[PDB]
Design a protein around this ligand. Structure first.
Ligand SMILES: C1=C(CCNCc2ccccc2)CCCC1
Ligand SMILES: [Mg+2]
Lengths: 792, 231, 159
């Protein structure tokens, strides 16, 4: 809300500069976004009266004139302003003037005619005029005073942004009360005069709803809808951000900005019979005062009659009841609408008017009777008419109740943490509009005023004390608590996971949780992703079923900017939504993603840069898993976006916790990614707890043995290793593969594997008999299970 | 297409020592609860190790045999008391610190954590509660703890806490007590306006009871097979 | 009962933590060792023959008599311990104190500075089917030390 400071000064003049006044509003809960002068600063521009005008100089269409700005020997100046009456009085910038933009007119001569300033400025003075040459309309004549004082151009417009809990401050009266409370002054409201009824015309009461507990309507006949809008009311609405229309709409907008009670005038000749404040019929149609025609619902309150509908209650009037240039008699509405009956309904049709936002929030319910006298006073004074009686349709039992709230000094001391004087608590509340009665001895019984809708519990009153006393007077303290040692089990912390993945050479990326549905389909063509209902773009519309749908665009971002090697990792929430019949079946799994393209290590003199193979990437994933004491078995993955021959599924206790392997080379070409290495791991599996158990160490030397198998290439080395460990027994404590060979000497379809057998004894020293017995037992079961040949 | 079960080409993950793991586990209880880890030199002099702990000098609490020394006023730490002394002499209460580190005695090198808490007021009741849930949450059991009275020149009342480990046995795990007034007064802290307690536990004692180790000589032989068991 | 305190956010500046250093060195393939702060004077003189060792007045033995001027005087015995028990590859790292007593005219001139040491014997990676086991060169070891310095935003120059 933007309001004029001078208009605010007419209610409360605190005799302080504009800076400290805006500081008081911000420190009161009313954040001032901007305080600027009505017009940009300029020095030297007084008012003059044009005497004579002569035309046709220098061809084209100009006119040389002489203006008397109080100077003894006034000079001339040329201009081409197309006006009507010649000899008008208009402010004129002098020769030493400094109009905005360094427009210091240096006099000189306009082709012979000596000049002395510029007697114009329709738009050069920051005024918003329609026709060119309308510099200073000849409304009157301030007799040569500075233009900054006649139109009050040095006034400041205060752009206040007020929170919805302070619906009372959406007006000059609401802001002035705040400025009066903080400065211990009393607001001198302008004396309102009621209009006496001379005629006795119709009326109508309707209680078909509960959202209008107080309605006031006045029939006023023979009004001048084409009346002149005065400069003071036009400017007050202008610098408050409100446009000018007719004389009746400007008055209702003026009282709306002055008191906060919205009003609306109808065309009485277009109201048939009794007026109704009712709920709309299901899918009832209505054409508003704008060209927009809306289709209502049966929960939107409207103001109708015995046949049609006239307006949406407190939101926007209709075109069928609008006051046109053929309007003679009007019906003035001044009602209070329940905020619960207006909230949200205006946003359905893309509407947000000054009457809408004020009725959705709290509006003074004791104000309809006051705004009716305000408009009727201004209508008769500025337009005139035959005024009738005031129709009061009031259901006083359903008005917004304001029961007494109890507040004790102990509650204010507990919540604020510091003691505020009981004289301060009573004085601050009683000037904000509350009627506080000192119950008992130390407690109070404070009732909230009729204009404030944010006082319901005692904490609301405590917030009011800290507001008026000042938030800069909040004493500093520290909370206290008991030193209790919380339960904690040894685990792989998330911070230690980052340090490991960063040590392995990966940079932490943070991509959007939503990605493109098309890229999500490219990775997994059988995916059913969770789609947003209102995404900002097509590429951010699908909640990522895998972190690749959002990391790949980040990789492509760098690859397109001369980056051969980019390695990312993210933590890392994916959204599993497949095989789900409802959104409550959605699974949000925190995961650890790995994306690597380019060479393993940066370019150096040690070797030519070459991308990783599967075992370089597996060696990094095996260390991340080993860093969390995770025991893992690997099996071939069948995920669509993976190379089926070089992609593993990471299983623990038989169930999968993630995958690792390169992207499917077809997807690499569709995305222009060269060779990429991707992996994802559940954080719950990596960041797991662990427990170490001590086992005794043998004190006698171990024995090392070698076995060289020639086996087919279609049997995994894990099954060979697992079989050796089982048949080896308890004496065989560890085994590991150390050589493979698929060159000359081995037939196609087979490979020569060399395993290392380490035999350990818990108590004694190994004899050659028990070792050879185990060696012969292992080679025999290997020849029987897989049909292999052994050596030593 | 290659065999996906072959071992990867990379580096085997390293190992953190079990003594440092237990040391980090005990400290994290206090670290994320208001206490700050403090450290200091291991070669100390005589004042910060004896005279400032309410030990007059030739008192029976010296035992010059089992304390490594170089001159007559320079020795190896028997406990991390110097850091707690210097913290009290420079800083002012409230003081909430835990002091890990290795100490030395002639038997030879072992670690022990010694906490110190000095505020406007504390009591023997708060020392017992903080120690009980420290022992309960460390060993992750519902232990049966015993508080025995003992003597320390820097505490009064002083206590020693046991836990029912092994087979119904009482094993000492840590000593504690309320900071003696002369220890606070000698460091510039008014013993009438400020109260304080302290404690001290051997890390090798906790590590063996936690991991089931019976010969603490392995802690410093550093056998790579032993260290790998904690990885 | 439990002690009560005022929760106050203590001062803290971003830094390379000690717990993050252990994780980086462990990822490089080193096991944390804890060796005695006193070592043998013979090995202390074998490393640096011009050393002025701080020697004990009542040492527990001959091999535990001199406070280590370098962590190597106490880590080398542990490296030999494993080697005497069929351990081709042993990679240690210790975060303890060394006692600089060189050019010191009195005991209070002693400088006890905390150090991070690295000892590596054997192949850089454990035995696997990818390559025959071979010991590290200077650039394998420099690449590890460079990453430790890089993990703490340390800019260095080598001479
Ligand atoms: C305490 C100390 C002494 C250092 N040892 C801690 C301990 C305390 C109680 C029992 C056993 C061990 C330093 C000055 C302040 C009070
Ligand atoms: Mg409030």
């Amino acid at each position: 809300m933007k309001i004029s400071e001078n208009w605010l000064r007419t209610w409360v003049n605190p005799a302080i500069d504009s800076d400290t006044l805006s500081d008081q509003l911000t420190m009161l809960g009313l954040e001032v976004d901007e305080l600027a002068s009505v017009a940009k600063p300029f020095t030297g521009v007084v008012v003059g009266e044009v005497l004579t005008v002569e035309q046709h100089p220098d061809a084209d269409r100009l006119r040389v004139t002489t203006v008397n700005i109080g100077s003894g020997e006034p000079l001339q100046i040329v201009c081409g302003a197309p006006n009507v009456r010649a000899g008008m009085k208009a402010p004129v910038a002098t020769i030493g003037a400094v109009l905005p933009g360094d427009f210091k007119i240096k006099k000189g001569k306009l082709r012979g005619v000596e000049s002395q300033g510029m007697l114009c400025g329709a738009s050069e003075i920051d005024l918003e005029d329609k026709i060119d040459g309308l510099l200073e309309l000849p409304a009157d004549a301030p007799v040569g005073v500075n233009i900054r004082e006649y139109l009050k151009l040095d006034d400041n417009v205060i752009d206040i942004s007020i929170t919805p809990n302070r619906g009372d401050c959406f007006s000059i009266r609401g802001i002035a009360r705040e400025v009066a409370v903080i400065n211990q002054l009393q607001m001198n409201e302008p004396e309102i005069k009621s209009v006496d009824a001379t005629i006795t015309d119709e009326k109508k009461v309707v209680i078909n709803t509960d959202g209008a507990p107080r309605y006031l309507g006045r029939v006023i006949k023979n009004v001048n809808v084409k009346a002149a809008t005065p400069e003071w009311m036009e400017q007050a609405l202008a610098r408050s951000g409100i446009r000018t229309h007719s004389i009746l709409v400007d008055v209702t907008n003026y009282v709306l900005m002055e008191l906060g009670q919205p009003m609306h005038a109808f065309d009485l000749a277009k109201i048939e019979g009794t007026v109704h404040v009712r709920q709309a019929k299901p899918q009832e149609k209505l054409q508003l005062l704008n060209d927009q025609e809306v289709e209502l619902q049966e929960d939107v309150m409207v103001i109708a009659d015995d046949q049609k509908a006239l307006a949406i209650a407190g939101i926007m009037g209709g075109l069928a009841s609008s006051v046109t240039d053929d309007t003679t008699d009007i019906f003035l509405e001044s009602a209070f609408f329940a905020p619960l009956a207006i909230a949200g309904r205006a946003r359905r049709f893309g509407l947000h008017t000054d009457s809408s936002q004020r009725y959705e929030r709290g509006v003074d319910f004791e104000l309809p009777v006051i705004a009716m006298n305000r408009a009727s006073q201004l209508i008769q004074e500025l337009a005139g008419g035959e005024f009738g009686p005031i129709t009061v349709a009031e259901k006083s039992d359903l008005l917004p109740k304001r029961e007494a709230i109890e507040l004790k000094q102990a509650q204010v001391d507990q919540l604020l943490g510091y003691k505020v004087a009981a004289e301060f608590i009573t004085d601050a509340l009683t000037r904000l509009g509350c009627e506080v009665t000192v119950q008992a001895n130390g407690e109070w019984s404070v009732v909230p005023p009729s204009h404030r809708y944010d006082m319901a519990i005692y904490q609301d009153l405590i917030e009011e004390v800290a507001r008026i006393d000042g938030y800069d007077n909040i004493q500093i303290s520290l909370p206290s608590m008991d030193v209790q040692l919380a339960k904690y089990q040894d685990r792989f912390e998330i911070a230690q996971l980052r340090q490991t993945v960063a040590t392995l050479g990966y940079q932490e990326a943070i991509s959007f949780s939503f990605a493109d549905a098309k890229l999500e389909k490219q990775l997994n063509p059988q995916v059913s992703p969770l789609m947003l209902a209102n995404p900002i773009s097509s590429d951010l519309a699908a909640m990522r079923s895998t972190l690749l749908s959002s990391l790949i665009p980040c990789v492509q971002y760098n690859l397109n900017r001369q980056q051969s090697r980019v390695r990312f990792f993210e933590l890392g929430l994916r959204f599993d939504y497949q095989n789900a019949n409802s959104i409550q079946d959605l699974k949000q799994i925190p995961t650890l993603a790995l994306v690597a393209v380019g060479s393993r290590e940066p370019e150096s003199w040690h070797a030519k840069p070459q991308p990783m193979d599967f075992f370089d990437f597996k060696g990094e994933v095996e260390e991340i898993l080993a860093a969390g004491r995770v025991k893992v078995e690997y099996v071939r993955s069948e995920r669509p976006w993976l190379h089926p021959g070089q992609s593993a599924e990471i299983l623990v206790d038989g169930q999968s916790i993630g995958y690792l392997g390169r992207l499917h080379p077809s997807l690499e070409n569709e995305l222009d990614l060269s060779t990429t290495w991707v992996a994802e791991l559940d954080q719950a599996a990596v960041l797991q707890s662990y427990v170490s158990n001590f086992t005794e160490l043998s004190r006698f030397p171990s024995v090392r043995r070698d076995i060289a198998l020639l086996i087919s290439d279609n049997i995994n080395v894990r099954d060979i290793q697992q079989l050796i460990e089982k048949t080896g027994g308890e004496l065989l404590d560890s085994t590991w593969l150390f050589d493979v060979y698929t060159g000359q000497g081995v037939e196609e379809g087979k490979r020569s594997l060399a395993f290392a057998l380490l035999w350990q004894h818990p108590s004694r020293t190994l004899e050659d008999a028990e070792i050879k017995s185990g060696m012969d037992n292992i080679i025999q079961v290997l020849e029987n299970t897989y049909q292999a040949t052994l050596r030593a | 297409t290659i065999d996906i079960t072959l071992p990867g080409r990379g580096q085997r993950i390293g190992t953190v020592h079990p003594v440092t793991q237990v040391q980090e586990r005990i400290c994290q209880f206090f670290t994320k609860a208001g206490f700050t880890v403090a450290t200091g030199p291991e070669v100390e002099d005589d004042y910060h190790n004896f005279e400032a702990l309410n030990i007059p000098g030739h008192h029976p609490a010296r035992a010059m045999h089992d304390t490594f020394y170089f001159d007559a006023n320079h020795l190896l730490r028997t406990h991390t008391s110097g850091v707690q002394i210097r913290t009290m002499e420079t800083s002012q209460p409230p003081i909430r610190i835990v002091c890990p580190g290795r100490v030395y005695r002639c038997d030879p090198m072992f670690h022990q954590i010694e906490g110190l808490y000095v505020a406007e007021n504390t009591s023997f009741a708060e020392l017992k509660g903080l120690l009980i849930n420290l022992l309960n949450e460390f060993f992750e059991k519902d232990l049966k703890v015993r508080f025995r009275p003992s003597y320390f020149p820097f505490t009064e009342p002083s206590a020693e806490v046991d836990i029912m480990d092994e087979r119904g046995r009482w094993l000492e795990v840590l000593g504690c007590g309320m900071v003696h007034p002369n220890v606070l007064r000698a460091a510039g802290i008014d013993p009438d306006k400020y109260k304080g307690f302290a404690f001290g536990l051997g890390v090798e004692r906790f590590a063996m009871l936690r991991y089931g180790i019976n010969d603490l000589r392995m802690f410093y032989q550093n056998d790579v097979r032993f260290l790998r068991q904690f990885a």
